[PDB]
RNA sequence: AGCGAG
């Protein structure tokens, strides 16, 4: 597939119709649609070309034509169009400019009246663009638009149980965007009755007659059901002018009723588009629903009054238990109940409709200002360039980019991690569900998630359920909906013909199972196929006659948990952490592909973006570790520069490296030069280590974990991590602050590596406290105590009247410095007001695993690390090979994850390498084995893709044959255990214990970062009880959980201690200290400030609080 | 894997549930039963089958296998892990809550 | 906002 990949062979037995889409689909496509390029014009025009237009397109077509209240004058704008970007994107990423383009849109301006037409570009302003890797760069940082999950516009008649009646009442919500919502619900008492805009409730024939119904034709149309009938009756209501001044006297009460205020009235609030705007999705969901205008296009999204009738007639005709119904003109659709939940009613704010969103709002503002300038604008004085005003629009543009929750700050730990940060769909936002606000039946799974949404991969904390991934063939519908997609069998004869079906499509046809065996004449091979239907119940089968069939296993899972082998022997929860924890693996310095792995590795690593992929065949023609010179088979050659230890937002290393050689002859789409996590261009998260599985001595307690020291040795669980340190000279009242190495008052050792300049020296190690970056800002006159005073007479010193205000290496952390970066505005650099200069220092650390530190494999199998024994004291195999790690026992049977073991025991033999004894025919637990899977060599990466794989008879079989190591002597007997020396005592263990190659990540949760002490320091502002944070010097929070169990324990002076002195006491803290210091008894603690800040805010509060003495 | 003993009489007990299942969906398929009790019938049959298979599975166990040996000393874990280990994992519930 | 432990 991929032009030069290594060789993982696989225990596939199903061939696969569908190769894995363009994982990044989901942005790039969604942001080509909004800009309206020309490969989403042909890209459209192949599958509807009836009405392609773009996102920007369609803002600007709805927007125009303008016109003022007397219709003098009209403005209009036309053909949007894009200028080159600014910068490229590199450069944009260094210096903090955002990566955008100019937009120009030509504006029209015709006086209707004197019929004069202007037209000019207009420059709406730099519209942020998305690099190639589907993410967005905005004030240098790198970020990315999460796809949101969101209610799709239309009606929903939902049906529920009256405790005081036991009676089934159903109900009505036509849901548009920016309206106001119609619910005709129907009450025990046998009576249908709306409720506009959530104003107490009315009687539909009210409405009706609103809408200048006669009670004649009412009974002509809902006539059929006897609730309509009683509400007639009892509606009390005669004449259409009666409804609407009642109509109009409950809706806007206060102002005096009219005839004219109450017919615009509704007009206005249902029928124009100015102010219920269904959106395309919304009328055309309320289309199919109701079969209204179903061959028609779909243009003028507001409502008609057809449209209110047919709802109304659709829940009578429920309510009465109807199942299908026939507007009169409209085609007969099933009437039945609607689930918000389904991926039928779920529909998908990709980035292209969040950010076309905003720009609606900007122009809409931007219509407003123009529209309200436009009567004190002299007639003929006028043009569009001097009649549009681009700031609303660029500063709603600019504040959803940065400050809205859906444009995320882009996670960068490793290339899964960012590419799984895109195909993320979030239940939350803005105009979503919010964490509080969202029920618990919205975070459940759903059948419709199938194939559309990944069941497993999913946040573990207070974000389970609001939060999924995109599976991987997963598509997503022009109006929003996310498809599937389905192999068509056709008279029980399975096809190729891909069809992808959202959900409501899947749910009318009798889908079945990917693993369903082919007799190869693409029948089935067998009667009872299995099959999943309508009402989303997996049951009992109709042999033949099914009408579709999945494209392939894994259909249901997501990239990141596409890449757990043995998923199927692991429990939901154990997989959950597993996916959820391959994205916090850091990168380690040089990485190796698993042993066992799937075919999502490669695939994952290609369209994460962080691999260098050569974009033309060629010859290599100069390769060297900074950039690879290509020549093309057509005279050009083209130069693919490294990231050479650049640094990610999480602080990891960005490094790349070339894996071709300077002669190689390199196809295109080809990987030249592997990521950080990246092994020969797929994915490497983490290690291959020898494992046991047996428990030792304590240390590896509770999902601890003990590691040889040769892993600290050689070297193979380290990262470089690179920390960035900004101090910027500003410009202060008392002057200007000063980038210098001359300090105040500090010696001329901690003055040594600081460079002519100030900024300290590349390559120049610095610990926690030596200082970076020498900073000096004036202090004013102040008044030095006479002590002072009289010390720098006897010192002979002056006051400087300068302070310091220096970068200093903040409190834990150490290392060399890889570059400085300086802007300067007397280099006439862009820097924000006030600062003359601004400096950057790069710190790198190589840090080795240490105890304390977070590990864990693919299958949820995580935790610290206990103890780093000596590679001596190491259980080592009969051959002398120590172990490297060793698991734990007690936390494989319960937590339901065996699928590790599986994997260990694979691991083994793929490291050993195999050779079935093929003398007498295949042997029968080998039959179903691929061809070349037979023989393999010893360290032979291997795949066993997500739902098949190799089953457990494949791998005792493969366990039995592990072609020896060196000599005559297989250390693991066909059971997978092996008989291991312990390491302090000399003696063999009694029983054999299972080993093999388990490959494990180092997480993101280093101790290094985790450590944090404090016995003094910053106190915040209104009261004490000094600052939290380990960013800060942070005190230990002490809630009131642990004060009461402080009560509980009976140590009152305890807990005095702590919240007085400890915490807030301004008084007694200074002289607990001078007690500690000088070896007197701690003092009596007295009142704490936050007590007093309390009286303070009750008698501002008029509550006269008095402190009685007795 | 190798430690973990699947118990010989699965396909036997799997087989003579799934007739009984079979005969519940034929007395469905005749208008017999509503939805409701044919679902309570088969809820009943699947669990008295996980029961027997459960059994199956704890008698067939030697008392020296590192799982039982774990589960029974009262180190950690229960036996309904053990069977869902090995056997049958049994009844599913709904989404809403139902089996 | 994402994220960790329970
Ligand atoms: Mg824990």
Redo the contacts with the bound molecule.
Sequence with gaps: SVPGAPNRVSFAKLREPLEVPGLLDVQTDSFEWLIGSPRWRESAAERGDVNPVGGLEEVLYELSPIEDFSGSMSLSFSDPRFDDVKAPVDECKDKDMTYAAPLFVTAEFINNNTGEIKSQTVFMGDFPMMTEKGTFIINGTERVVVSQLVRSPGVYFDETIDKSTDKTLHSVKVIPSRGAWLEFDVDKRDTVGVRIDRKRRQPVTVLLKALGWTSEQIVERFGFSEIMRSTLEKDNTVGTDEALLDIYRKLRPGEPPTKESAQTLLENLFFKEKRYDLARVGRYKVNKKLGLHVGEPITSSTLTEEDVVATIEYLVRLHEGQTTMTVPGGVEVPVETDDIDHFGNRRLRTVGELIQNQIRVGMSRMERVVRERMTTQDVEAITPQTLINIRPVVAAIKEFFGTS?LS??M?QNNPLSGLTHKRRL?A??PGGL??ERAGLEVRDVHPSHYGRMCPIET?????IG??GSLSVYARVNPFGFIETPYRKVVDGVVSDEIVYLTADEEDRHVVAQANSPIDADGRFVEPRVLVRRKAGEVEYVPSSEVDYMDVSPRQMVSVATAMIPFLEHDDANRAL?GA??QR?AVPLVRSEAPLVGTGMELRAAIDAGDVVVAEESGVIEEVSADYITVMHDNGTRRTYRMRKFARSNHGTCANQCPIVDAGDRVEAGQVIADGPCTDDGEMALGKNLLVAIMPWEGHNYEDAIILSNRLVEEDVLTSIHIEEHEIDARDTKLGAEEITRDIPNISDEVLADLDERGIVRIGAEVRDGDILVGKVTPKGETELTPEERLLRAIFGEKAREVRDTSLKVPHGESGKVIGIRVFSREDEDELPAGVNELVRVYVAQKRKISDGDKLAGRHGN?GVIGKILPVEDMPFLADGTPVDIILNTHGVPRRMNIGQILETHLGWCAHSGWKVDAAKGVPDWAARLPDELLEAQPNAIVSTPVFDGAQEAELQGLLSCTLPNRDGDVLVDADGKAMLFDGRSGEPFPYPVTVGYMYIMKLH?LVDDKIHARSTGPYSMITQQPLGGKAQFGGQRFGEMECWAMQAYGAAYTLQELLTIKSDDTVGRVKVYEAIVKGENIPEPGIPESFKVLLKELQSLCLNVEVLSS | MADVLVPPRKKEILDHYEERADKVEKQFQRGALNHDERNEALVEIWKEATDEVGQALREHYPDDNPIITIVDSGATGNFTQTRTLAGMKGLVTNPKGEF
């Design positions: 929750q995320q700050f996670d979030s939350l936002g919010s964490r946040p573990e904390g207070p974000n609001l939060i952490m959820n924890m916090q995580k949760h």
